[PDB]
Amino acid sequence: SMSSAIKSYKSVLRPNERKNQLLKSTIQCLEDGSAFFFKMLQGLFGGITPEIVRFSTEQEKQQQDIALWCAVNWFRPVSQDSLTHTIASDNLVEKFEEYYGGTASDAIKQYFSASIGESYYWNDCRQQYYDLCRELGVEVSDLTHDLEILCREKCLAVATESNQNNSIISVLFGTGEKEDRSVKLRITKKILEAISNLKEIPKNVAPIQEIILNVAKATKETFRQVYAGNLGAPSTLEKFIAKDGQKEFDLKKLQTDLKKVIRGKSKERDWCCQEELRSYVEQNTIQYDLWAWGEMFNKAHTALKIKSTRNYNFAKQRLEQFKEIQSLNNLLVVKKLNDFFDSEFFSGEETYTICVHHLGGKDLSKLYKAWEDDPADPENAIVVLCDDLKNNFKKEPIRNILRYIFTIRQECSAQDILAAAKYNQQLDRYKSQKANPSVLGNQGFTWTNAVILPEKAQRNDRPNSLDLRIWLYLKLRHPDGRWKKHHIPFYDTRFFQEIYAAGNSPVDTCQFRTPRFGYHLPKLTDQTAIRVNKKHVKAAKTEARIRLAIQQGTLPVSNLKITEISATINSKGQVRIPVKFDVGRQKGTLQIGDRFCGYDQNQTASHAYSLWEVVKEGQYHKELGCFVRFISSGDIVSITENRGNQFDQLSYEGLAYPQYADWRKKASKFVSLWQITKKNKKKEIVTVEAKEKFDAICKYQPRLYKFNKEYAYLLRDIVRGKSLVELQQIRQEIFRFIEQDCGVTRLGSLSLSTLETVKAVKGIIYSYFSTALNASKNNPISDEQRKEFDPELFALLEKLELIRTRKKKQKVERIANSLIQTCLENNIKFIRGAGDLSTTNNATKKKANSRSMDWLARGVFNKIRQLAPMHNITLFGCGSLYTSHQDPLVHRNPDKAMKCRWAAIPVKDIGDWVLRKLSQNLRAKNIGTGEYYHQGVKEFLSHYELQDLEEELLKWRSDRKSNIPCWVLQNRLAEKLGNKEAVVYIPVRGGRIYFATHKVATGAVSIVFDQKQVWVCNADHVAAANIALTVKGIGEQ
RNA sequence: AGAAAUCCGUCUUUCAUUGACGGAACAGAGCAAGCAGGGUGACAUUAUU
DNA sequence: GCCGCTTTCTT
DNA sequence: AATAATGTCACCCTGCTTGCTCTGTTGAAAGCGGC
DNA sequence: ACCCA
Ligand SMILES: [Mg+2]
């Protein structure tokens, strides 16, 4: 089978005033018709029966809840605009049972008990269906009969069975001549009876073709006429007759197809209310037009069906969450846990939900055992817990809660305490959970065959300026009600460059004239002579480069074979153009010669890729069941040049320290002039010279962008206590920092550090507004107040946020492009990546959550997933569980293999942070990764002959003054490695070195460490290799 | 069928009328968190009397 | 063959 | 025994901000009559 | 576990 993809383009229409009136009026007409279809289909779907759902559900492998599918169509949370029969939440179960003739399911209970937003109210759509029957003047059962026909013909979507596009318009209201269904039904059943009791099953299709022709009394040239009356798209049976007599025959496939045809054409389309419905629609919309009625129907039907499907799934998920909540409801331990706030440790006035992460989670057990281990005197067992449970990611537990839980350890078990906390937060999430309202929405309308084909375009090409217009030929509705086609232009130099410009190449032939699809435009020259308005030069440049290419006979012509292009337009005049293109044949399973890759996402370092190949002989991998060979690894990079100099937009950290003295200087000059104020417990003002903080920032010689982020924090600190008068000089300093020289509005890469810098600058302006307007708990301040006080600076707030948004969008796009070019350059057909990565949650520290919000791991994954099929590259999502620590080609080849990560530190640079990490890893005698870090330190001590230090390391605590200082350990390693510049390998979490069994990273070199031969590899490249060699899917397998 | 238009964006103490470059989009609903001030409440380190 | 309409299609 | 510096953790508030997921859409393929 | 001082 032939796999394809979709690219799209997007711009704004530029009609003249007359055609603009026509277009806006037509769109308003379509929108009014869409609203009418929305209300009417709301009622119609309120009319469905359990039989209709059963018939639409019957052939589905997963069993379906017919009652829930009825409920999500009979009762809908809605906006005021489609609210016709308001029903109180209290009577939902009663009225549902009345309609269903049976007691409500528990999932339906959960659907009805769910919260809905402020502006949505429950609507009884079955009552609306009854009133619609009255409005049409037809009996309820007659409209139900027509509804059965519509759902049977797939004109409407019911449950898991989707609609067939907009065929409802042609089927119910069409003016033309229909199929002869009885002929088809009879022929189909007699061939199925001719083909289900064969005494020999042929391996080719020819005897079957002969049987079908004999059954239909037809030849191969007449079969379409005989079977379908020459009407409609070719059926499965026609295509079967058409194929070469030598193709392999699939009996089960053909029988399945014939069964579908028999099922779908066993009954007539014998309408009862066809003409009433058609008069109703024509009266409440416009006169019959298949396309316009289709557009109205599409908008309304899509809205309703997505909401009802979502509510079905949501109700089932809600029932499961409720069952879980009811299981953990041990109810006396729950109340002891929550009696904390009434106990004598909570000295506060405002309570909060006690969560599992407030209790140290799993590790609570350890605390428990210590209490029964060393009772009566607890407290230091509490702090050993807390101190061993510090992370830069996880929220740390609350002391007073642990203290209080000592008081009830004898009766409430750790099992049940954690169960109670989990119950707490689950219940909280469950009361908050909201059902989904049905709303028409703001989607635009699609004109079919809307774009003038590029070869038929009307070009007013000047020798020094190409015609850059693309014209739509749209049907528009005039005030008298007649339709007429009109020409409307628009500009899109991307669409012009990739598709629309006329190509004149003898041999160049490509899908899209863009670098990632293999085409590079020729460069401009000194004889190019661009002279346009400034706000047009970039677009102009593109035009020029196309002109030159046509001038050289070098511009390729699109090989896409476009016969029609649609255009989607909204009320704002925006136009969207989709282009479907074939990407090639659907790949089979891995064979020898297929190349695959994996990629690793990081936030302070580059993303990494690892490229592998399936081979005939060599390294066997059990999980893959084949021989593999490592090709190469690399950093994911997106480089642009400035007058010869290269910059990686994804990772550039800015100028080195000695390079930005002047900038630094001005900051210094400002900060000498100011102090930082602060309020003492006893309220009193305490000041500090603000320049000490600046010196602390400078001492470690940061690069420009970290320096700007830290200086932004310092400016925010300076702003805090000031008067209105002080805030004005500080304001000139703020503007100068933001806009001149190296401020964020002029300099900054796409790196994570730059995004954090911009957010810190926004923090400065926020603090300025809060200080100026005297914000407090008793005086919340607002945006209107902020704009009233200082519109310029408020506008910067918005501008900085827009800068961040554009940076992140560009960065996701560039990361995906870089990986895709790596794959295309190395003929990689398979990409594999973590669909697992964290976003944010309560149990995580706020700073980690904020960084993850700027990290966009999910966005990068989704972008790779969007781009890869455009080159017939298959992406698989996988779990990231332990992918930073597995030993490539050893792990699960055949058993688990894991090692810690390492850092290369000069012996010189080994401080107390190193000793802290050594001590901490040496007590890391725990499950998970810590095992491997404990091992690590062991090897370290063995490799550097530092066993005698071990005990000093185990007692190293960040408080102790008896701690072994760092210079002992530096002196020992200097003794042994010869000098103070010598690299020492220290086992550290997040280290960039991995000691690998095999050469699994480009540039890795072999060493012997603790008498084991190992490859010193980029740890991120190793993680990418692990991801590449993963085979089991995200959830489990 | 009407000569205009950056389609949307990125980088650089370099801002470019020949600098180097990147991108399927859209709608609604829902979920998750962040920030600035202001408050509460634990702990730790410094020192001291 | 184009344009604009119809219909059926289980790929 | 405290008081106070300075610093790290958590938990609230009002009003603003963004990332991500769900369920979809942007039709396919043939013949007709009038040009 | 991913993410990192
Ligand atoms: Mg990594």
Numbering used by the authors: 0 to 1036
Direct quotes from the study:
Two Cas12i (Cas12i1 and Cas12i2) proteins have crRNA-guided dsDNA cleavage activity. In addition to the double-strand DNA (dsDNA) cleavage activity, Cas12i2 cleaves ssDNA in trans upon crRNA forming heteroduplex with the complementary ssDNA, as well as processes the pre-crRNA to form the mature crRNA. The Cas12i2 consists of the recognition (REC) and nuclease (NUC) lobes connected by the wedge (WED) domain. The RuvC domain is the sole DNase catalytic domain in Cas12i2, with catalytic residues Asp599, Glu833, and Asp1019 lining the active pocket.
